[PDB]
Design a protein around this ligand. Sequence first.
Ligand SMILES: *[C@H](O)[C@H](C[C@@H]1CCNC1=O)NC(=O)[C@H](CC(C)(C)C)NC(=O)OCc1cccnc1
Ligand SMILES: *[C@H](O)[C@H](C[C@@H]1CCNC1=O)NC(=O)[C@H](CC(C)(C)C)NC(=O)OCc1cccnc1
Lengths: 306, 306
Amino acid sequence: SGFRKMAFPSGKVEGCMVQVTCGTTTLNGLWLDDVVYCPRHVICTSEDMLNPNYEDLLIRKSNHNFLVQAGNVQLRVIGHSMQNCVLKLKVDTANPKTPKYKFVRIQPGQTFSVLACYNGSPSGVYQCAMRPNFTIKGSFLNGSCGSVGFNIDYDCVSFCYMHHMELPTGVHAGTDLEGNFYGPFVDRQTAQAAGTDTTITVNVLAWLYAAVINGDRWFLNRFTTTLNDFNLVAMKYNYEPLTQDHVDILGPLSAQTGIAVLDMCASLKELLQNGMNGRTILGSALLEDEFTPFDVVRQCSGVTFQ
Amino acid sequence: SGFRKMAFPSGKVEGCMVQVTCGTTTLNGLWLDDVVYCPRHVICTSEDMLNPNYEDLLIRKSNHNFLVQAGNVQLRVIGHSMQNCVLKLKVDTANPKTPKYKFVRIQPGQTFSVLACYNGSPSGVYQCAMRPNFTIKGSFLNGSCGSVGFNIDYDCVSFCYMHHMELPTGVHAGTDLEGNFYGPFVDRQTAQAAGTDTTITVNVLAWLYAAVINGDRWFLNRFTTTLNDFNLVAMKYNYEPLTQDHVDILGPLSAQTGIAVLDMCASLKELLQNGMNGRTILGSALLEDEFTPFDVVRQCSGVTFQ
Ligand SMILES: *[C@H](O)[C@H](C[C@@H]1CCNC1=O)NC(=O)[C@H](CC(C)(C)C)NC(=O)OCc1cccnc1
Ligand SMILES: *[C@H](O)[C@H](C[C@@H]1CCNC1=O)NC(=O)[C@H](CC(C)(C)C)NC(=O)OCc1cccnc1
């Protein structure tokens, strides 16, 4: 037993991390086969980053302007091109550590692991959710751009995130690995801001099931509620609507615990209306919304990856 | 910016994880050079685990009773011996992925990363602290024994934990890699229980500094306190005494924020006496004690590892 914010083992992604330097700018790249992927603002300098035109900036570049270092070994750039907000540097060496992989784009509410990197060297790994407002609450310092987010499914790495910037509230924005931003953000210095967020209701319910599985039961009650009556309360507390698909996805956890989904909704209702009364759930004094139903089943059952 | 519970990149440890099967029991082993380390209760069966004598059990064993699988490749056991509560299986192949490593024993209050594993396959990674009562609040299911805890220092893996069991409160107990238990626990089925815990005061202060660094300032105040007067309040709320060494270790974070350690103690005092009043610190509604001063400096500064 126990329930922890758990990341995927990072080894398969560590073997892909490289350092990309162009001019004064150094950041991380992702080396898969003979391509290195990195944020396109590497071609920028401190006065270029105000309002740049990357197509104009990139034609002025040469292959030899791009210094790529994989550990203590320098990779020769033999081609370059831009794909939306990422750069693809073609190198003369295929990464022998390339895992089986996919480029996937995730949905708000879904979770992934982040391998934070500086100078092409991995620093730490942690779990993130894509917020409803398409930001992530990460931990990123200068030099972390190009760090990637991912999930692992048996042996296959699904890359879903490349880090690009921090917003003024301290949250983070980035792209999928095709270079398309998550949310209404651009890789320029403007007055961009996150904008309003909501709480991921289905995830909170998943976590309440995790709690019951782990022996926290004090918030359970004999009452029930209809889906519509729950959603009236959800809206008042800035929770997203729960759909019948959410109810269906919570079926397995319902069945394992014997607690009907709508019953657990009544519990959430009371928790929202009365608070916690000085008690905790799974060591938290707040309702936690960054575990998906999949995360709970994985951890509270024990799935591995080769 | 941002502050997350961050584990070390796990790749160096993933390359050491193997599966050890003896009779009906399967668990994880740690393969370094030509030795596989695993919990000695692998030599036990369901009626042996009540009150065993492992010396008697082990002389009855043959090398060929031990099935060791590194991925899809079977390692020939050529020797075995017991070291306290771990078994050392000598194998005919040195692990070509052996990192530079040390076996270290950690102190209560210190943190480490856990690579949770099943059947020799890594499942997830997460950060743990050694509680003052020598338990860890982990996430471990059947088959997880032999999973190891570790820290990484540049390129060197310091192994500090091997998982052995779960206590009746859902917390976890294990050994260092010399096979000596953390705390007053034995690898047998008895009525063992955790016993009383305390909150790691120096870590809470470290986390308050992390919060200030990240823009959470509402809990700051103009008051100060003496170390003795703080420790009188600490004892009342079941916090460990703060020592002058703790104060010294918090110096750098004090200097970075301009908040004297004893000033931050006055803030902690008020937080303990008034609670949080519906506010949060770094996304938590409780005082967090599983980040060390080192963890805060590492994350709030950006140290990496090769
Ligand atoms: C890339 O390494 C960097 C990552 C930032 C730096 C601090 N935390 C991060 O996540 N990204 C940027 O510096 C980005 C550059 C572009 C606007 C994409 C061109 N700008 C940015 O994040 O500005 C906000 C910021 C910068 C530095 C410190 N705090 C906030
Ligand atoms: C080893 O894989 C296993 C790990 C346990 C199982 C559930 N969570 C864990 O951490 N360890 C044991 O089963 C251990 C065996 C010895 C007493 C060391 C011989 N016993 C144990 O942990 O008993 C408590 C328990 C077992 C199973 C489920 N919940 C609690």
